[model samples]
Target: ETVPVKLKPGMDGPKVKQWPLTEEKIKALVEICTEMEKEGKISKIGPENPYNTPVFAIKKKDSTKWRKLVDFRELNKRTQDFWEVQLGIPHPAGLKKKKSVTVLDVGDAYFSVPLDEDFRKYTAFTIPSINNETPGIRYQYNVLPQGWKGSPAIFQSSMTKILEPFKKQNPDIVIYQYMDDLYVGSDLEIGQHRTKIEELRQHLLRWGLTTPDGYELHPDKWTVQPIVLPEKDSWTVNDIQKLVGKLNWASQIYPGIKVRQLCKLLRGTKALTEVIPLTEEAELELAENREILKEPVHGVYYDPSKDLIAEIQKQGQGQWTYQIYQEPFKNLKTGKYARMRGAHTNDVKQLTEAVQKITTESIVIWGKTPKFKLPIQKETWETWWTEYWQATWIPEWEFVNTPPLVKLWYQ
Candidate 1:
């Protein structure tokens, strides 16, 4: 994916000035690469240049047919499973207080890479050819770009190697790596935890990784507490609430909690605050709070509702409709307009009967309606279908005056 470039200092338009990249940003990248290199989470770097190291995904040739290159359209067609269903809607599983629980809150202290050089071509080779490429030939290939596909993998591998010694010394500490983010957990005492974090930080610096502003020590910002889970071992409401609390207070103890964002697993929970109200200053505070909560913990799942909508919309036509039906279709039978317009006639009929039966039966059995009801108003239906339909299918419509498409395109 192409990373969005922020408007820099030297760009001449309405806003343009020449300013050097901040030391903080430089340190961050270095920390990432160094930690990965030390941890051995990626393949070896090539001799051509440390920056040109190649990292390739292990491909399986015998299994199935060739995988098709998915275009944006196809990718968009896929549903977003950001929130795991078993984890429950919009919540995390509750954490139970353990008699003796060990949690290793491990993460890269800092990261760095050569910013002036390009490593693109050097990092593109297969694992077999990594050691064989000559420096002259590799340089001629013009590798070492920042956004190459293998950069993260190569960095991760380096991190794994860097952490190898620590891993050996404390086998009890569980290390989890997802790209550049690292988590170390153990049920050790506070002193032991501090020692481990200090050891890890020193090791990272020795290996050329620079700890940037947001690094935190274990037990301070990083704690080993029991997290709650749903019946299916998923996250629940209590989980979200706890995460919010932890994240909100992280900055007071951890200088630079922003490093937590690198962990992808907690992104949804981190994003919940976006919908909440806040002033400019408060927004920044909330962002920092989210940054701390962003770190991933084992057995915890983060699911954002918007992401779910995006994923469902991607599957196929009427996927959103189908999802809505599957939720409370049984209890949505009488009184409202059961027939949905614009859907296949047969599908509309089936849906109407199914929903009506569900609602009628529920009313008879409970003698009252459920508080959290599925939308039934015509306007509500129109709005839901309008947004989803426009997102999923309106683009393909031939009508020049397709209102939804026009509005979306303009937006």
Candidate 2:
């Protein structure tokens, strides 16, 4: 791990110490650092300009695991932020590359590289002395240390240099690097994939480990009735976690089906360890989601263009109808719909239209408001108001597209 990099100008440091931890924790910390020392990742020495940094150990939240850190705020402020490490998403089944990608972890990744002795002295931290003879002890990183601004760049660069030449050795193999992990891919058809899977299982005694559905999902044993509901048994966030992955792929088969509301459910699931509560509203939406999936799913729709989807509701005293459609169709939700024109293009024509067609005023127009002065009795307005309040228009955006849309015969 020897990579003697320099710290930035005007930020030279000497030995520094911080507030002590509990004796129990301090003992554990000392034991860990001592083990790392035996492994030669760091060493103990006293020197001027140990570029002294604060050091401590912190336990991970919700876990007994603890990690050591060097408080290099001053050092980082002085060091330039220089990094060119490339990282990748763990899964890339959608790639154009050939097939069968696999990965491995460099268990002790950062400890693989060393630091130069001169700069190593500047990386020291002071800890209270256990022995009676010496004042306090100072130790520094012998390897490319964690939490350093330049350590990642150095580690990645060195590893790439080591692995870059291996790609040329095998013409059939393709390898991609992301820090300490590697991915490999090759070519195969559906039949080839089947043969390949059985081939892998043939080696199951030594190691471990699907086919495409009509929906292009490449599903591994898919069941139509259980698509949206997945194999989940409960309504907690964990169920959502298990089910959503199935739903994620199902979106290709069932497109635009109140997926937004279901996605809103994900806001509560930001962390993997934390269990999020699934509310009654979210639960109902999930049931309805599965119900819609009961229908055949080929195109998620059939010849479905020129369609409008809106969720109409009350906003205080005024009416609010939101267009759930994406893009230009989103224009429908605006107070001023942007796509089409109104009947009569003038006040009286619209007025006459509203009066004659009680249906016309209800029919929304794009870009303009209707001037329909319906000469109705107060009782008529009261009747319309009561009907509107009785039922809310929450369209189930799925399985079909036609209007008055998933809805309307109001006219």
Candidate 3:
């Protein structure tokens, strides 16, 4: 089955921009587009299409190949928000505290979904003219293109329905879907967990074969690798962008290092060619973050039933540092620590929100209140903390753990 794309009422198509591609790149584009045409993902269209967007290619990571991407900035601005219709998917943080997990990534996830014929014109793309002798060709996506604004939401909606039967069949296993990344997790024993993973894979394969329009999983790209950090101390803006992508991958595995804020800083206004000089402190933390990523301690698979220690330290009125502790606390012999991860933050709501993500399905032991003063009156600080714990924290965490007899008395 195919999906239809929608746009803002009476919106004109994207304004065409010049994308200068080298002769080599243009040849590669022609080869790829021809192959895609053979596969029914795209088709040659008349040269005078008014809704054309330019195309550009970027080198793929860990490979010598380049991926052609549509410049959808103009098109996206005028497109309808299809993603708003459905509820958002689970965060990868949901993968935490699971005893076992298996991840599945769909190959060409967006291209697997066909787009309606009427809407294809809005996705028109041009392969630039090589020289005065040769004219450029125009093509439009027959299937959903990679850079379309609505692709992820549309694709995710399909996946959600596709996996419904599998979820019902295995109610005990937790299924986490974040667009193309699908994870099946459970707290079962090692032997049983392996079986569940195999079963899930078989389910996916059968569905892929039976459903003509369904996507296939990448056959050999199912495992995780330690992130690769650059060797130099100083970095370019491009280097920082690569780091941001690595941090994103790391966030799913290592929950301790809060890299999002730093990522935001790295991705801010800066030329890609600009070099950033790092301070001694920055260099040391960079090493530490990389070290944390390579090690398996904080990346440990967790059991949801285990108790959690929520450690919070107020550094200032606006800032708080928090860490989480679980069973089998730090080991001195092997230098391997427990599941301890800390974050530095000024946003109280954001701090608590992260705590909620990490402490899911477990009883949290909110340790002793740290000694500190708020910007406000001392009495007001106490009232604020008490209201926070009683109204928000205690109800969700403490009450679930306390016995009814003591719980009644405390209330």
lDDT of 2 by residue, 26-77 (tens): 6766877888789988788855543577666654323465556565545544
Each model's TM-score, in the order given? 0.25, 0.35, 0.43
Report, for all candidates in order, the number of backbone clashes: 70, 11, 0
* Regions of candidate 3 where Cα sits further than 4 Å from its true position: 16-18, 58-66, 71-74, 86-104, 107-113, 130-133, 155-157, 169-202, 209-411
Q: Model 3: per-residue lDDT, tens digit, 224-339?
A: 33445666757787877666556555554465655544554465588887887664545555666878866555334444444444433333344333334453332111110122
Worst 10 residues of 2 by lDDT: 208-217
lDDT of each: 0.31, 0.42, 0.53
> Which wins on TM-score, candidate 1 or candidate 2?
2
Model 2 misplacement above 4 A:
1-4, 14-17, 47-50, 59-66, 81-107, 128-136, 161-411
Cα lDDT for residue 345, candidate 1:
36
Number of the top TM-score candidate: 3
Q: In angstroms, how far off is 207's CA in candidate 2? A: 19
Tell me, what's the RMSD of every candidate?
A: 25.7, 24.9, 21.2
Candidate 2, position 291, lDDT: 77
Kindly report which residue stretches of model 1 are placed more than 4 angstroms away from their true locations once superposed: 1-150, 210-411
Model 1 agreement with the true structure over 85-204: per-residue lDDT tens digits: 211122111111111222221223212333212312223222222233522222212221222212233344456677788888877665543212334455667666656666766776
